[PDB]
C-alpha cells in the first residue's frame, strides 16, 4: 500500500518564502520520480519541480526562479521550497508518485492528499451590505427579484436571511466570491410576485461571525 503525505504551514504572507515536504511510504526513490502539483482556485493542477534519488531536478519555467526541490534519502522525503510568494500562488499542493525514465514520468499511480496554503495579508473586516432594486416593472414573467449584496468582509462565512426567515419563496443563498484585494462578497435575492410588490417590506439580515457584523437593510422597488 504505497502512501504519501504532505505537510507545512497553512497560512503564508506576501513576499514570504513557502516551504513544504512530502513523505513516502513503502518504497525508495531509486528510479522513482516525485512531483509537486498545485490546485489554483477553480483551475486545474500544475507542477513546479521534480527530483529523483540522486538529486537531479526539473523546474517549471515560470516558477524557475522561485523553486527549490531537494531529497532527503536517509529519512525518505523530498521538500518543496517556493520563495517570493504572491497572490497568484494560492493553491493546495499535491505530491504524487512517479515512475519513468530519462526525466519523464511514465507512470503516476497514487497521489497525495494535498495540503492547504493560503496567501493573503487581509485583516478581518465587516461586510458592506448593498440592497439592489430591480426595474420594478412587470417583465415577461410575473417575477420581481429584490435583494441585498454583501461585499468586503473577511473571513468566511456569512449567511443572509430574509424578514427574519418569514419569507422563503424566492430566497436563494449563494457561496461567496473572492476579491483579489483580500476581501470577499456574497449575494441574496427574493423572487417575489409582481403583484405583491411595492408595499410589502423586504429586509435582509446579514451575519458575519468573525467580524460580529449584524446589519439590517431594506430593499425598495424603485425611486
Amino acid at each position: 500500500q504505497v502512501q504519501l503525505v504532505e505537510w507545512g504551514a497553512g497560512l503564508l504572507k506576501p513576499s514570504e518564502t513557502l516551504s513544504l515536504t512530502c513523505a513516502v511510504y513503502g518504497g525508495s526513490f531509486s528510479g522513482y520520480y516525485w512531483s509537486w502539483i498545485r490546485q489554483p482556485p477553480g483551475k486545474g493542477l500544475e507542477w513546479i519541480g521534480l527530483i529523483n534519488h540522486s538529486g537531479s531536478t526539473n523546474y517549471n519555467p515560470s516558477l524557475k526562479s522561485r523553486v527549490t526541490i531537494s531529497l532527503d534519502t536517509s529519512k525518505n522525503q523530498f521538500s518543496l521550497k517556493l520563495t517570493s510568494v504572491t497572490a497568484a500562488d494560492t493553491a493546495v499542493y499535491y505530491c504524487a508518485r512517479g515512475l519513468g525514465i530519462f526525466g519523464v514520468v511514465t507512470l503516476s499511480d497514487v497521489w497525495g492528499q494535498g495540503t492547504t496554503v493560503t496567501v493573503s495579508s487581509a485583516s478581518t473586516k465587516g461586510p458592506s451590505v448593498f440592497p439592489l432594486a430591480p426595474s420594478s416593472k412587470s417583465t415577461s414573467g410575473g417575477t420581481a427579484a429584490l435583494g441585498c449584496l454583501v461585499k468586503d468582509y473577511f473571513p468566511e462565512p456569512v449567511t443572509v436571511s430574509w424578514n427574519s426567515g418569514a419569507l422563503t419563496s424566492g430566497v436563494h443563498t449563494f457561496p461567496a466570491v473572492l476579491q483579489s484585494s483580500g476581501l470577499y462578497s456574497l449575494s441574496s435575492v427574493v423572487t417575489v410576485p409582481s403583484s405583491s410588490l411595492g408595499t410589502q417590506t423586504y429586509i435582509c439580515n446579514v451575519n458575519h461571525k468573525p467580524s460580529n457584523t449584524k446589519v439590517d437593510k431594506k430593499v425598495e422597488p424603485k425611486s
Partner: peptide, 9 residues
Amino acid sequence: SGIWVFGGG
C-alpha cells in the same frame, strides 16, 4: 518539458 499542466476543467 515535464510540466504537469492542466486545462480549465
